[PDB]
Design a protein around this ligand. Structure first.
Ligand SMILES: Nc1nc2c(ncn2[C@@H]2O[C@H](COP(=O)(O)OP(=O)(O)OP(=O)(O)O)[C@@H](O)[C@H]2O)c(=O)[nH]1
Ligand SMILES: [Mg+2]
Lengths: 423, 40, 153, 526, 157, 484, 39
RNA sequence: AAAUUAUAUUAUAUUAUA
């Protein structure tokens, strides 16, 4: 008959204890009465429950999304007329987005570095023990025998390292043989990926298959192979004007004596020109992305205000947005001394364009204050779409000036881009 | 008309750049959930 | 590079002017004594502005993360947005106080109507030869207006 | 290329020169050209990327003439130049550290501590990064990889990142699984354990490996280090609402966490027991929470569920009190009055049955004398004030007495019957004298400790107000609804007038006293 | 900021009452004030001024000025009384410049009153000792001001 | 795909709010359906339920302290019973006949509910009510435009009439002051009347409070009233208002004047029954009504227009404007306010800021696109402390809790009643994005929240559902590639 | 364009995923909705 | 029989008959 005002759950009691601690600490905004703290706690618990309800209804709505054209589901995207106008990426755009690396490649690189360091330590141990010089004859090269047999390396790995599995020890023996022969190159594994055993014709001969793989790997990483691949890709029309200009500049840097010394070799005078093109040709291992510009922040050190500009119609609409960080989370936007809901006459389709640079940045609008000064033609009302376009460009340039990495999504949404249309 | 003065970034107006990292992390989470389903 | 761009150098100068503004020092300067319309008329509207505290949801959302979650909520200028780089965390991140009389600029329209007519009518209401220090103060002022048909002439 | 025209100045930035120099640095095959390229890269103004640190650490680890201190100095130079360490560079440095034994042991331990700090910072960074995406499976794999990296280094993850990771979880299964991971990270894999078949887990005995001083302080015990994570799991089970495809009950989850805590031999702290029986106090099962509060009270009175009675338990009871004021207050506020189990213990052995729907005066008199004997033998009011525990927390005992009298007066809990039916008149007279005794004890406690700020909270005051309201409703239903029977009717009217006078006094005191904090109780009941 | 119409529609082909199109002289435009300037049929001094753009623009400027004047005068809840310098309150004991002469003057920056003196409006009930010394009967009652520190319904009591 | 709509059964209809459900084919993806498994006659029992339910229809006695910042509903029969006058200026914009009748229970609503609860027995708690009002006769509620002023006035009229208290409700004060026409009072010299508003008030107050007005005996009322053949002389106050408003024109024009005069006379004498008086827009009753005094040449009489020294036919002129205190209704109201012998009438009123905008310049309003066509032409500032004898209560805009609850009720109970998106739920964004965006667009102003909830239809720059459908279609394609 | 041999070289040390500033190709597009089938 | 060059937008006109 009488509802108890006291906190009824442990979550309610914990939030009430937090509100009491905030009131005893003297924080600005925390109420001093107990009924207001009770109202605060009940409303926060109801807000948490409503957030959980929204999350659960989005989980259910994800599975019933009409992905096909149906009764109420219309394309209307120009997918019939133009076709696939919206892009989509499966890679994190660096350095705006972050996806953690997969554990398989991490463990593979970890094990490869472990085996390489162990083989290098065993090679240096034999170099200290044997006493210096070690010449390999032609028959010793054809027999492919180094200073250590496989049995000696296996006995050393069994004696020094007790905790060592069988296949790991055999891979260690193989890598020690590969490191004592030459410096180790990780080229046989990728050639095993791209070239199968049935293609060359060795199905019952694994040893000759791995011998051919390591021979092709040691012949692949030479300078002449890279030069021949660069010339082949130059013949296959894989260059732009930028690569042609950089090859011309690298040709102009060579003098005549260096040209004669490079043409003494058969492949180096082409390689000095085509080094950058062979870097480009080598794929995702060695070709870099261009990427959007990431500048430095131009912020007032005293007030914390960044300045951005926006234009529309060339002469008619000019705007300058001043942006500051609001630390009390009461952010508001103002255009020429009047709040945004009264400048644009409460029109949602005009103020959503001003909200959009905060949306594409994944930023909260309440953490920022903004004032937009009109420098173009003064009119009694700017409630139109072109003025809102200029406002969006001004707010986006101010956000770019404040935080520099905000230029990575905001340029991709086209909000920093100026069109030239006049009347 | 002829929209040649309009930039190429304004004609499709590709918005929604905030959701891509969330989609990629959700894809990685679903791959690990499928790996958990296949093992048990 | 330099520090700011052309419009950014303009509005950082307007904040240094209003920081040292004193209305009795605007004696005979003319329209150069008008104290930066945006920040001046904002101060005249403090009877209407009345800077509110942070809302009860905001101070609850922070204090849960400060105390119950052991991970403080940091400002958007404190977020290390670059993956692969550590930023030198500039000092204006959370030290700027949020006051409505300072920023953002919202004013009464009647004060803005009175400001804009007073600034143009007092254009040549300037006392040039004042008994003062250097380049402002003098005893006689000569202005030689040269005119020609070309700008490089 | 240094730009000269403004068109190529519009495509110039040092953050894009980072990618250009990264691609050219990966294009090289050997470290002598790579170090020259890096030197002319860092001489120029160029933002140093994580890719630069990755390719430099990897292709300097595999170079032949490299000493490992130059690898760690190169890492220090790159992190000084503004490059964030990732898991790849951390694992590269861990591999270079593991393959270096010719360096002196102080250098190895310094680099080991640096890698421990680096792995903990990366773990906290990934916890803060993958939190809002609800990536609990991916974050679970990342934390498993970090645990595997740190157990190989002879350490474990810190309890601070464990408290944060438990506070950012969403599912209860991975919550209990990560408490299991923290319990197993301290002990080796051959440690004895106990099997929980409800969760299909094995929780190990942790007190044999925890540090202990056996004058002595609280921070010298490792039991605080484990009970911090236990408290983080308990508070997460309080505040957050878990989302599961088949959601478990709160009683089952609390009992599984309680057996997970009790099967380890860790020494219990104050606020952990307080939070646990706070969860017991606001539970919805009327037939269960009595035994739950009894079990957590036994845990707080013993202090540890270890099988042997050690001197470390006596040192822990001498340092801090697990039987503090909050646990006695929440125990009295959690118990049922008409429970036939005894409220207080007898020689710490068991809480026996009562010697007698019996709602007589002698029953509740034995209950109240048992409550007062419990408050006397625990000694929670005689404890000295300190920094960690204030004087304000001892008012919770009076709140527990007030909720006990509330559950006597009305029949219901927090979630035409105006009171509990089936009572007698002398029951309500004894209840009114108990309200007066609680008010007198609270006034005496405030008068004794006036020199520090001691206030009564909302729950005790509202409980006393609703007991007086229930007594008022009983009086007005017995007076004009009693059928004009003469059996000490003037005693009923005297009790009614005393209830009205004390209630109006409490309402005017809630309006005036304590700085107007309880103004809403004046606004509601008047 | 105002969203009302200020300019006149230009001269073109004779419009018809269609969708997104109103005739050039309609009773809906400008409150029907185009009724003075319209021709109902589908003397040169009375026909040429209805088709001139500067004439109709001057007429709609006059009508918008009349609307601005009546809305500025309907805002007035006061009147200007010439009070001598001695009996005036302390904020008006200064040298007040004329309109558009100086910077818009704050009321009292020392007493934390940052507001325009020209927009200050004083109550009639506080100046009865100045405006009415001859009555002596207190023609207006004193203004009841609420106690801000009193425990009321606003403060949960 | 997964519909779960053919398996969905309707829950049993208890009140009007439960009956406001649309067919299941409408809100199938708007309000998604979940499945639960209970343990009755088997381990699985597939029960398909809705994620969202309607807010509970609650009696004002059942509203409590824990319902602050929550949403409740009132029945349509209770809406007809308790409000025959109408509602506020913009309160009924959110209640079509299909929609539930929802109300947000704010903190000030709880304060005024406990105040009205103490008004119901005022002679015992007279010192408490004096301490609440600070000795004043009542409360005046002020704030910016579009807040919960008139909504709280309808809420306290609901609170007062649900507890059987005689309640005066003026749902809009602009029908009195800014009315159609003004007529001089028949029996009050120098006073004026708004006849149509008085006829509507004498009808609706009588049919609202017939339960207590029939037991109201006429104390100071003449018994020689003019009465047609077959009509009964009034012996009750309800009979008096039935004599007043039920008449043939033009006899009702003077009958309403006599009825308002004697009704305000009969109200001023009752000192034992509590009478709550709720006026929406007291700031219009505190200044001049928009009527002006007639020119004296109208009443003087003319022989001709050429030689009579008059200009009523030549030039217009603005005569002095009639104040509100010269209306007999507001005369009786101010007579009850200023005379201190009435510790019985509680004036829980508010102001209105419904006026047209003016920001330095003003052109002419466009007749097609004008949100302020029915707005008041006043432009005058108002101060409730200086211009009213009541205690002022300041209501601001919504905090995020009340705004979240109100927007959740609006969106979900519009889609549940078959008035929202429905099958087109996949085109609009989810609730968190809608809450963020409407909190930007409105500034949590409640009228702005309603206006931007209606303006959510024309949002152009939301790209959430597009990227979500791209991701789901890509996931479906790679799942079919995994299946192959 | 035409088929070439670029990217077909074996990358040294297998660290082609940790280079996050690598070339990501031209931006591909995806359908937002499956159009109805022709037959 | 495809590619689309296609501008497209809306209104008017006569000795009704003087
Ligand atoms: N149901 C309900 N609606 C509310 C509540 N508060 C605000 N509203 C909405 O807010 C809008 C504003 O209502 P009003 O009270 O008439 O606005 P106002 O403050 O009087 O604005 P003016 O008339 O200009 O003074 C209404 O249309 C309601 O839909 C509430 O508590 N319950
Ligand atoms: Mg209103």
């Amino acid at each position: 008959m009488q509802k108890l005002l006291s906190p009824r759950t442990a979550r309610h009691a914990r939030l009430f204890r937090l509100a009491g601690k905030l009131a005893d600490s003297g924080s600005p905004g925390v109420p001093k009465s107990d009924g207001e703290r009770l109202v605060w706690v009940n409303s926060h618990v109801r807000r948490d429950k409503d957030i959980s309800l929204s999350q659960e209804e989005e989980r259910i709505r994800e599975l019933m999304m009409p992905l096909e054209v149906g009764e109420n589901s219309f394309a209307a995207n120009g997918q019939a007329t133009h076709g696939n106008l919206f892009y989509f990426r499966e890679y994190p755009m660096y350095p705006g987005e972050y996806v953690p690396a997969e554990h398989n490649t991490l463990s593979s690189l970890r094990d490869e570095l472990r085996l390489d360091l162990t083989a290098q330590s065993l090679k240096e141990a034999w170099m200290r023990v044997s006493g210096g010089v070690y010449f390999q004859s032609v028959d010793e090269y054809y027999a492919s025998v180094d200073g250590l047999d496989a049995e000696q390396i296996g006995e050393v790995l069994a004696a020094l390292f007790p905790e060592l599995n069988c296949y790991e020890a055999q891979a260690l023996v193989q890598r020690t043989l590969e490191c004592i022969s030459r410096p180790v190159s990780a080229a046989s594994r990728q050639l095993s990926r791209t070239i199968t055993a049935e293609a060359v014709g060795l199905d019952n001969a694994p040893g000759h298959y791995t011998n051919f793989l390591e021979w092709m790997g040691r012949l692949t990483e030479t300078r002449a192979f890279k030069t021949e691949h660069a010339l082949f890709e130059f013949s296959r029309r894989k260059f732009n004007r930028d690569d042609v200009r950089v090859m011309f500049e690298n040709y102009r840097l060579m003098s005549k004596a260096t040209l004669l010394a490079d043409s003494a070799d058969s492949y180096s005078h082409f390689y000095t020109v085509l080094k950058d093109f062979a870097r480009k040709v080598a794929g995702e291992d060695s070709r870099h992305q261009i990427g959007v510009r990431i500048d430095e922040a131009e912020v007032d050190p005293e007030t914390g205000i960044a300045v951005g500009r926006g234009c529309a119609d060339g002469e008619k609409y000019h705007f300058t947005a001043l942006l500051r960080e609001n630390r009390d989370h009461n952010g508001i936007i103002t255009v020429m001394g009047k709040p945004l809901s009264l400048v644009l006459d409460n029109k949602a389709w005009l103020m959503e364009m001003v909200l959009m640079p905060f949306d594409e940045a994944n930023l909260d609008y309440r953490d920022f204050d903004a004032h937009i000064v009109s420098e173009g033609h003064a009119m009694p009302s700017i409630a139109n779409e072109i003025a809102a376009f200029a406002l969006r460009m001004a707010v986006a340039n101010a956000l770019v000036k404040l935080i520099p990495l905000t230029r990575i999504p905001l340029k991709k949404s086209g909000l920093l881009s100026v069109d030239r249309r006049r009347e | 008309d002829k929209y040649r003065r309009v930039p190429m970034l304004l004609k499709p107006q590709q918005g929604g750049q905030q959701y891509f990292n969330h989609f990629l992390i959700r894809s990685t989470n679903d791959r690990l959930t499928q790996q958990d389903v296949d093992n048990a | 590079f330099n520090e700011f761009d052309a419009k950014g150098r303009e509005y950082v100068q307007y904040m240094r002017e209003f920081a040292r503004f004193d209305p009795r020092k605007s004696r005979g300067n003319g329209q150069k004594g008008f104290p930066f319309r945006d920040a001046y008329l904002t101060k005249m509207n403090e009877a209407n502005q009345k800077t509110p505290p942070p809302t009860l949801e905001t101070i609850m959302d922070r204090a849960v993360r400060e105390h119950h979650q052991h991970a403080r909520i940091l400002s958007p200028l404190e977020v290390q947005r670059d993956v692969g780089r550590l930023e030198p965390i500039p000092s204006y991140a959370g030290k700027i106080n949020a006051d409505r009389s300072v920023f953002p600029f919202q004013w009464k329209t009647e004060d803005w109507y009175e400001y804009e007519v007073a600034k143009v009518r007092n254009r040549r209401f300037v006392f040039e030869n004042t008994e003062e220090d250097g380049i402002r103060g003098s005893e006689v002022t000569y202005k030689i207006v040269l005119e020609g048909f070309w700008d490089h002439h | 290329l240094e730009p000269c025209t403004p068109r190529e100045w519009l495509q110039f930035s040092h953050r894009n020169l980072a990618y250009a120099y990264n691609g050219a640095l990966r294009a090289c095959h050997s470290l002598p050209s790579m170090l020259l390229l890096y030197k002319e890269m860092k001489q120029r103004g160029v933002k140093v990327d994580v890719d630069t640190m990755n390719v430099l650490l990897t292709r300097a680890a595999r170079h032949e003439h490299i000493q490992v201190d130059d690898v760690f100095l190169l890492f220090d130079e790159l992190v000084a130049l503004g490059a964030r360490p990732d898991l790849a560079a951390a694992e590269t440095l861990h591999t270079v550290l593991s393959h270096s034994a010719s360096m002196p042991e102080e250098w190895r331990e310094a680099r080991r501590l640096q890698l421990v700090e680096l792995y903990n910072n990366l773990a906290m960074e990934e916890v803060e990064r993958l939190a809002p995406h609800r990536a609990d499976r991916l974050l679970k794999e990342q934390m498993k990889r970090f645990r595997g990296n740190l157990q190989q280094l002879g350490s474990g993850l810190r309890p601070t990142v464990y408290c944060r990771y438990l506070h950012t979880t969403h599912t209860a299964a991975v919550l209990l699984e990560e408490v299991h991971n923290f319990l197993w990270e301290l002990v080796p894999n051959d440690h004895p354990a106990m099997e929980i078949p409800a969760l299909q887990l094995r929780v190990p005995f942790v007190a044999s490996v925890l540090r202990r001083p056996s004058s002595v302080s609280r921070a010298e015990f490792g039991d605080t280090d484990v009970c911090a994570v236990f408290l983080a799991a308990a508070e997460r089970m309080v505040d957050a609402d878990f989302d599961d495809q088949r959601p478990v009950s709160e009683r089952r989850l609390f009992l599984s966490l309680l057996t997970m805590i009790s099967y380890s031999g860790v020494l219990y702290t104050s606020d952990l027991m307080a939070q646990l029986m706070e969860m017991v106090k606001y539970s919805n099962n009327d037939e269960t929470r009595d035994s739950d509060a009894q079990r957590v009270l036994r845990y707080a009175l013993r202090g540890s569920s270890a099988a042997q009675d050690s001197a470390s338990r006596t040192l822990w009871h001498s340092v801090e009190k697990v039987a503090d004021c909050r646990v006695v207050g929440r125990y009295i506020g959690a118990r049922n009055p008409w429970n036939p189990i005894r409220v207080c213990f007898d020689e710490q052995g068991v809480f026996k049955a009562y010697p007698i729907e019996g709602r007589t005066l002698e029953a509740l008199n034995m209950r109240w004398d048992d409550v007062r004997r419990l408050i006397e033998c625990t000694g929670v009011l005689v404890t000295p004030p300190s920094e960690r525990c204030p004087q304000q927390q001892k008012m919770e005992v009076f709140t527990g007495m007030a909720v006990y009298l509330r559950t006597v007066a009305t029949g219901r809990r927090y979630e035409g019957t105006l009171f509990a039916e089936g009572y007698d008149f002398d029951v309500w007279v004894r209840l009114f004298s108990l309200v007066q005794e609680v008010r007198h004890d609270m006034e005496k406690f405030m008068a004794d400790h006036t020199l520090q700020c001691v206030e009564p909270e909302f729950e005790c005051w509202e409980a006393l107000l609703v007991t007086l309201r229930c007594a008022l409703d009983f009086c007005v239903v017995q007076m004009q609804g009693g059928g004009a029977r003469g059996t000490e009717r003037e005693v009923v009217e005297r009790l009614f007038r005393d209830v009205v006078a004390l209630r109006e006094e409490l309402i005017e005191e809630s309006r005036t006293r304590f700085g107007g904090r309880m103004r809403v109780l004046w606004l509601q009941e008047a | 900021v105002s969203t009302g119409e200020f300019d006149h529609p230009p001269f073109q082909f004779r419009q018809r009452h269609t969708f997104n199109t109103t005739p050039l002289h309609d009773a809906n435009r400008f409150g029907g004030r185009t009724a003075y300037l319209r021709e109902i049929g589908p003397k040169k001094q009375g026909r040429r001024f209805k088709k001139d753009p500067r004439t109709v623009q001057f007429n709609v400027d006059v009508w918008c000025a009349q609307q601005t004047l009546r809305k500025r005068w309907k805002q007035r809840d006061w009147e200007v009384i010439e009070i001598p310098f001695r009996l005036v309150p302390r904020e008006q004991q200064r040298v007040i410049p004329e309109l558009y002469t100086d910077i818009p003057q704050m009321t009292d920056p020392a007493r934390n009153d940052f507001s325009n003196i020209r927009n200050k409006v004083y109550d009639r009930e506080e100046l009865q000792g100045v405006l009415f010394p001859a009555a002596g009967a207190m023609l207006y009652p004193p203004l009841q001001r609420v106690d801000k520190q009193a425990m009321t319904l606003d403060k949960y009591l | 795909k997964k519909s779960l709509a053919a398996m969905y059964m309707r829950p049993p209809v208890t009140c009007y709010t439960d009956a406001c459900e649309a067919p299941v084919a409408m809100w199938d993806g708007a309000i998604p359906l979940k499945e639960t498994r209970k343990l009755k006659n088997g381990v699985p029992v597939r029960t398909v339920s809705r994620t969202y339910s309607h807010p509970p229809q609650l009696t004002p006695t059942q509203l409590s302290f824990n319902d602050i910042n929550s949403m409740y509903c009132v029945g349509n029969d209770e809406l007809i019973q308790f409000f025959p006058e109408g509602l506020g200026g913009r309160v009924f914009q959110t209640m079509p006949p299909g929609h539930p009748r929802g109300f947000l229970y704010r903190k000030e609503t709880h304060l005024l509910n406990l105040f009205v609860d103490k008004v119901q027995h005022w002679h015992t708690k007279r010192s408490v009510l004096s301490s609440l009002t600070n000795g004043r006769t009542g409360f005046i509620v002020d704030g910016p435009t579009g807040c919960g002023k008139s909504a709280l006035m309808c809420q306290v009229v609901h609170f007062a009439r649900s507890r059987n208290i005689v309640t005066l409700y003026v749902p809009d004060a602009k029908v009195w002051t800014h009315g159609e026409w003004c007529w001089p009072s028949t029996i009050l010299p120098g006073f004026f009347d708004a006849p149509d508003a008085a006829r509507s008030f004498l009808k609706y107050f009588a049919v609202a409070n017939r339960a207590t007005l029939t037991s109201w005996k006429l104390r100071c009322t003449p018994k020689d009233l003019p009465t047609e053949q077959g009509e009964r002389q009034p012996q009750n106050l309800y009979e008096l208002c039935e004599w007043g408003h039920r008449a043939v024109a033009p006899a009702s024009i003077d009958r309403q004047s006599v009825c308002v005069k004697f009704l305000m006379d009969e109200l001023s004498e009752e000192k034992k029954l509590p009478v709550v008086i709720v006026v929406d827009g007291w700031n219009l009753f505190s200044h001049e009504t928009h009527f002006r005094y007639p020119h004296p040449d109208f009443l003087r009489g003319l022989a001709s227009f050429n030689e009579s020294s008059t200009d009523i036919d030549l030039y217009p002129q603005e005569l002095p404007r009639i104040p509100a205190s010269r209306l007999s209704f507001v005369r009786g109201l101010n007579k009850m306010i200023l005379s201190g012998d009435d510790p019985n009438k509680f004036f829980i009123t508010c102001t209105t800021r419904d006026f047209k905008p003016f920001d330095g310049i003003s052109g002419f309003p466009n007749v097609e696109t004008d949100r302020f066509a029915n707005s008041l032409d006043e432009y005058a500032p108002y101060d409730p402390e200086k211009d009213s004898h009541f205690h002022p209560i300041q209501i601001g805009n919504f905090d995020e809790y009340e705004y979240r609850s109100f927007l959740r009720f609006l969106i979900n109970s519009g889609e549940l009643a078959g008035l929202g998106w429905g099958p087109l739920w996949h085109a609009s964004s989810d609730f968190e994005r809608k809450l963020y965006k409407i909190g930007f667009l409105s500034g949590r102003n409640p009228q702005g929240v309603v206006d931007h909830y209606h303006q959510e239809l024309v949002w152009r720059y939301d790209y959430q559902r597009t990227r979500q459908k791209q991701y789901l279609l890509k996931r479906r394609m790679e799942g079919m590639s995994r299946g192959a | 364009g035409q088929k070439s041999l670029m990217g077909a070289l074996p990358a040294p040390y297998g660290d082609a995923e940790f280079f996050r500033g690598r070339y990501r190709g031209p931006p591909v597009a995806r359908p937002v909705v499956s159009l109805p089938t022709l037959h």
